[PDB]
């Protein structure tokens, strides 16, 4: 049995081989106990503030919303140590691994930001860490491979399947299923089997909590909507969580549309796939008619995953959150716009969320709205990718 509900409505669960159930129950118990331990919370807070640099800025864009009644703020997770929001929950999971007595870490990564975060946290806290990365993503996110290597982590390129995030995830779990007495699997997003979706949300909720406190201080009211890109769902649930009971606040999740939904080359199973069971959870999947898990596609490695965390499927199902998609080309234009008009170089992942907020502004420019975009990371890892595209155009 479990201490906490493993499902969000129909979505979620623990679909792993029986061998891994003691590992999941152990982690769940460690989490529940740690959330009650003021000494674990103080240590977590200490790392977040003094090591990662929280709280992050909330930046008001004045140039990009000119001539419109949109006020746009960016939650600056790009300024966090490591360059993205991934760092937040990795500090918490590293403390949990140590609370359990574990000594090794396994992790999967696509945009390499979660791998970088797992490697830096393991180096700080004295854990031996190994990261699985898809050989395609080794290439398109290569600044992060050597960052990982520099920090004492072992990086394992994954040539299976699409050689992207989902293939890394499969090797990660295969490995954990034969390492778990000593290693903790530091899953990088709010997906996978229970308790990961719950843990990852609680270890990222400071995104939404700070945003709430900061907008009230600056604007005296809640935002009309908060907007985040949705890979597995960690930064968006971290932004959403503290607003879920504020029913006036729209929660907008942005899936990668890739080359266009109609092409089939996208990463939007929440709206364009079908519920399936894979990676330990019941959740929307991109899949063939006869149940084979399909390959996803995004220009952004960090969104190039063919499922989504179960809490997002549930928030969608009851109407509490709305999900949309943004294509590669839209995400590229949003990247350029932020660089040239706000002097922030955003991750191509976050650029999807920016691109949707700009669409909300442009489509209805006399509508009064206060929007927050979760700027989930910086785009240094993307500049070569973006270079090669812009040069092939002009």
């Amino acid at each position: 049995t479990t201490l906490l509900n493993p499902y969000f409505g129909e979505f979620g669960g623990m679909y792993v081989p029986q061998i891994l159930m003691p590992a999941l129950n152990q982690l769940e118990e460690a989490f529940v106990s740690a959330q009650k331990d003021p000494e674990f919370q103080a240590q977590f807070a200490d790392l977040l503030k003094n090591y990662a640099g929280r709280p992050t800025a909330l930046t008001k864009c004045q140039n990009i919303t000119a001539g419109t009644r949109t006020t746009l703020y960016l939650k600056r997770e790009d300024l966090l140590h490591g360059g993205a929001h991934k760092t937040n929950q990795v500090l918490g999971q590293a403390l949990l691994a140590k609370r359990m007595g574990k000594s090794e870490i396994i992790a999967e990564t696509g945009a390499g930001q979660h791998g970088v975060a797992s490697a830096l946290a393991s180096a700080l806290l004295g854990l031996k860490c190994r990261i699985y990365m898809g050989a395609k993503d080794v290439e398109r996110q290569s600044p992060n491979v050597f960052r990982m290597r520099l920090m004492g982590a072992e990086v394992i390129p994954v040539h299976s399947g699409s050689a992207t995030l989902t293939d890394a995830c499969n090797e990660a779990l295969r490995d954990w299923s034969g390492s778990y007495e000593t290693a903790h699997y530091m899953l990088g997003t709010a997906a996978g089997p229970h308790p990961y979706p719950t843990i990852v949300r609680e270890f990222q909720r400071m995104i939404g909590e700070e945003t709430k406190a900061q907008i009230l201080d600056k604007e005296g009211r809640l935002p009309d909507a908060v907007i985040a890109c949705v890979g597995g769902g960690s930064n968006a649930i971290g932004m959403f969580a503290d607003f879920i009971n504020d029913t006036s606040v729209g929660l907008i999740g942005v899936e990668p549309g890739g080359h266009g939904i109609e092409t089939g080359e996208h990463g939007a199973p929440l709206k364009h796939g079908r519920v399936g069971i894979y990676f330990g959870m019941k959740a929307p999947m991109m899949q063939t008619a006869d149940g084979q898990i399909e390959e996803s596609y995004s220009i952004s490695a960090g969104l190039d995953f063919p499922s989504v965390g179960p809490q997002h499927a549930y928030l969608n199902s009851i109407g509490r959150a709305d999900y949309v998609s943004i294509t590669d080309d839209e995400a590229l234009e949003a990247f350029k716009t932020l660089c040239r008009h706000e002097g922030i170089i955003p991750a191509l992942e976050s650029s999807h969320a920016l691109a949707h907020a700009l669409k909300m502004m442009r489509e209805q420019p006399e509508k009064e709205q206060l929007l927050v975009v979760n700027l989930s990371g910086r785009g240094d890892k993307d500049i070569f990718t973006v270079h090669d595209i812009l040069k092939a155009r002009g």
Binding site: P17, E181, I293
Partner: protein, 266 residues
């Protein structure tokens, strides 16, 4: 499920265990696959464990991953596996047939509909690798409604609650996990005598050991320990891989290995 009971009641009257091979269906092609399976049975397989090609076999190491990929290259789909299964049953009326499934293929077009189709083609049991006992309810219920034995894993880290649920919910045979990890002949299997005894105490279905069985010594060991038999999937698929261009010598090398394995169980 009544084929397993009939088997074990005759295996024991002959003072031997069961040797159950595993292969992927359609590896390396539909029609060579069938002659692999006919050759396993004629060489002395007591029952079969049969995998349906899946896009993400997360309990399987590279040997069986490659089996899966070979079947995909052959264009082998689940619907073609079920026509294969019907031909195997129509050739082999008493041989118990178990499937190794992943949850998504069972859930894809309806859990009940999946088990309805298993019954239609003559499957005797279904093991769903990524479904623990905690999530097993709809799988075990649909299996029982269509007379399919739901196979449960007894792991080496089994506590007592697990033993008693597996014992009560399972039919056909209880799966004795050799070790942690994924399938592979590379990693050989802790002694499992104690779990075997507890399972018998609680009227579990009879126990077969799997994960890592690669040599005749391993097989006799498990029946020596009071288990009912052993399963070997890889070291069997590697014989298949070894002879992709050598179909004739593939089957002879298989036949040799199998009651080499079966004899160890007598």
């Amino acid at each position: 499920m009544e084929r397993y009971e009939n088997l074990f009641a005759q295996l024991n009257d002959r003072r031997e265990g069961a040797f159950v091979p595993f292969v992927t269906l359609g590896d390396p092609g539909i029609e060579q696959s069938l002659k692999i399976i006919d050759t396993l049975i004629d060489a002395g397989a007591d029952a079969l464990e049969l995998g349906v090609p899946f896009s993400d076999p997360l309990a399987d190491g590279p040997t069986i991953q490659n089996a899966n990929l070979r079947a995909f290259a052959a264009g082998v789909t689940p619907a073609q596996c079920f026509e294969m299964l019907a031909l195997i049953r129509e050739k082999h009326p008493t041989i118990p047939i178990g499937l190794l499934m992943y949850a998504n293929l069972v859930f894809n077009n309806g859990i009940d509909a999946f088990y309805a189709r298993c019954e239609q083609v003559g499957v005797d049991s279904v093991l769903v690798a990524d479904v623990p006992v905690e999530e097993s309810a709809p799988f075990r219920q649909a299996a029982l409604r269509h007379n399919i034995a739901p196979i449960f894993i007894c792991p080496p880290n089994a506590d007592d609650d697990l033993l008693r649920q597996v014992a009560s919910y399972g039919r056909g045979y209880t799966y004795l996990l050799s070790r942690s990890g994924v399938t592979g002949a590379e990693n050989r299997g802790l002694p499992l005598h104690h779990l075997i005894e507890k399972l018998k105490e609680y009227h579990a279905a009879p126990a077969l050991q799997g994960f890592g069985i690669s040599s005749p010594e391993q097989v006799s060991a498990a029946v020596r320990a009071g288990a009912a038999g052993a399963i070997s999937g890889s070291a069997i698929v590697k014989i298949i891989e070894k002879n992709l261009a050598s179909p004739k010598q593939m089957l002879a090398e298989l036949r040799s290995f199998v009651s080499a394995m079966k004899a160890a169980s007598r």
